[PDB]
């Protein structure tokens, strides 16, 4: 069938970065012209391969990773980055083969009153492994006193929320991200 990129890009609801969505695109024919022929996008950076040639290439599985982050966080969604988001939320492998596509989400994900429905992992006692997800709400202890799951001095709830009022400067504004990843596994390619 025609391949469900609409669902991923035109989704009303976007996951938080710490809780990031992943969709497996399979047994479909993928147009991709629909992406690089758009002006919505702020960023369309491909590492494995070339955006224009993707429609003339074939792949074993493709995955679409959707989330929301701050504007000045989009540069963390790349091979070789360190930072809150790359460290404790979404990490791309050094050998990442795929496209980071993002776009300014002020219209949708910013409330005049303020939207705090979007969270990021502020603290973790080790960096994530590439394409690892972690929903822990375990109280993070950086104090000598161990918390007994009871938040307080040096006992922070690990998830934190974004201030997304729509008049925040573009750095602090919301952007939706979609990371397409292309795996050439030993099996027959099911999506070109």
């Amino acid at each position, epitope marked *: 069938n025609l391949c469900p990129f609409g669902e991923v890009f035109n989704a009303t609801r976007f996951a938080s970065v710490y809780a990031w969505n992943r969709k497996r695109i399979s047994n479909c024919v993928a147009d991709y012209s629909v992406l690089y022929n*758009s002006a919505s*996008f702020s960023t*369309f*950076k491909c590492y*494995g391969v*070339s*955006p224009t040639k993707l429609n003339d290439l074939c792949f074993t599985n493709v995955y679409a990773d959707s989330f929301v982050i701050r504007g000045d966080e989009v*540069r963390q969604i790349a091979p070789g980055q360190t930072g809150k988001i790359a460290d404790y939320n979404y990490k791309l492998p050094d*050998d990442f083969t795929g496209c980071v596509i993002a776009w300014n989400s002020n219209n949708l994900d910013s409330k005049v009153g303020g939207n705090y429905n979007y969270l990021y992992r502020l603290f973790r006692k080790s960096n994530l492994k590439p394409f690892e997800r972690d929903i822990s709400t375990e109280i993070y202890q950086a104090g000598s006193t161990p918390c007994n799951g009871v938040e307080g001095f040096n006992c922070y709830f690990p998830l934190q929320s974004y201030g997304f009022q729509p008049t925040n400067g573009v750095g602090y504004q919301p952007y939706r991200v979609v990371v397409l990843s292309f795996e050439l596994l030993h099996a027959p390619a099911t999506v070109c």
Partner: antibody
Framework: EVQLVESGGGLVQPGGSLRLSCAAS????????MDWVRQAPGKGLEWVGR??????????EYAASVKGRFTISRDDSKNSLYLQMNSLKTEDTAVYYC???????????WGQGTLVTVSS | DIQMTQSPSSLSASVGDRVTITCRAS??????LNWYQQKPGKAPKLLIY???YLQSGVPSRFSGSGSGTDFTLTISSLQPEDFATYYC?????????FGQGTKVEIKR
């Protein structure tokens, strides 16, 4: 410091091969992407090709002007990048800079360049 | 391949004037567009990457704006040491193409 020094440039006859080397100091050669970019005298900047970094094998792209006749190559032991040019034309006359990026999307540092002159 | 047209090719500017060079692209290259300055007989230097980011060491009178198909470099108060060819460069797709350059000359 960061240092890229190119070599091998000089006078070569139409149809003859030459090979240039880019010798890289002051950084993790494996980590960085390294490209060749050329400039015939009093003309603009022309990309020759790329080798990706160790994490991406060391995989290569060529400009169409040099495809099939030029070859990009790496020696991590000697910390040097190579361009092997074969069925040379008058139009291959140019300065050959090597450029490295720690990202594949821009070039931080460039060499001073090697002049290849291709005439009878 | 993606063609990039700079405007203007040649440009004459008094010291301290506010000069603007525009790069335009045959298609959308989103924020994948870098700028280099080349002083004659010397290697280019990277001024700006990814539309808007000024390189460490580069003077802050250099600035990148732009998105999609239209980008522009800005020297605010163009000072001494600024006669160079100014080159825009897209990285979006291979092949890695450049703009024709713009030669800036100082008024006097």
């Amino acid at each position: 410091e960061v240092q890229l020094v190119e070599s091998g440039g000089g006078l070569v006859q139409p149809g003859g091969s030459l090979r240039l080397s880019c010798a890289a100091s002051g950084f993790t050669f494996s980590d960085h992407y390294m490209d060749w970019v050329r400039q015939a005298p009093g003309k603009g900047l022309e990309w020759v090709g790329r080798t990706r970094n160790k994490a991406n094998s060391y995989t290569t792209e060529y400009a169409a002007s040099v495809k099939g006749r030029f070859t990009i190559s790496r020696d991590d032991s000697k910390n040097s990048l190579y361009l092997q040019m074969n069925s040379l034309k008058t139009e291959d006359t140019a300065v050959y800079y090597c450029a490295r990026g720690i990202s594949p999307f821009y070039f931080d540092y460039w060499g001073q360049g090697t002049l290849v002159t291709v005439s009878s | 391949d993606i063609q990039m047209t700079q405007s203007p090719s040649s440009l004459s500017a008094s010291v301290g004037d506010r000069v603007t060079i525009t790069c335009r692209a045959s298609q959308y290259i989103y924020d994948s567009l870098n700028w280099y300055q080349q002083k004659p007989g010397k290697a280019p230097k990277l001024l700006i990457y990814d539309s808007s980011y000024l390189q460490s060491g580069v003077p802050s009178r250099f600035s990148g704006s732009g998105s999609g198909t239209d980008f522009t470099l800005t020297i605010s108060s163009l000072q001494p040491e600024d006669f160079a060819t100014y080159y825009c460069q897209q990285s979006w797709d291979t092949p890695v193409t450049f703009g024709q350059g713009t030669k800036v000359e100082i008024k006097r």
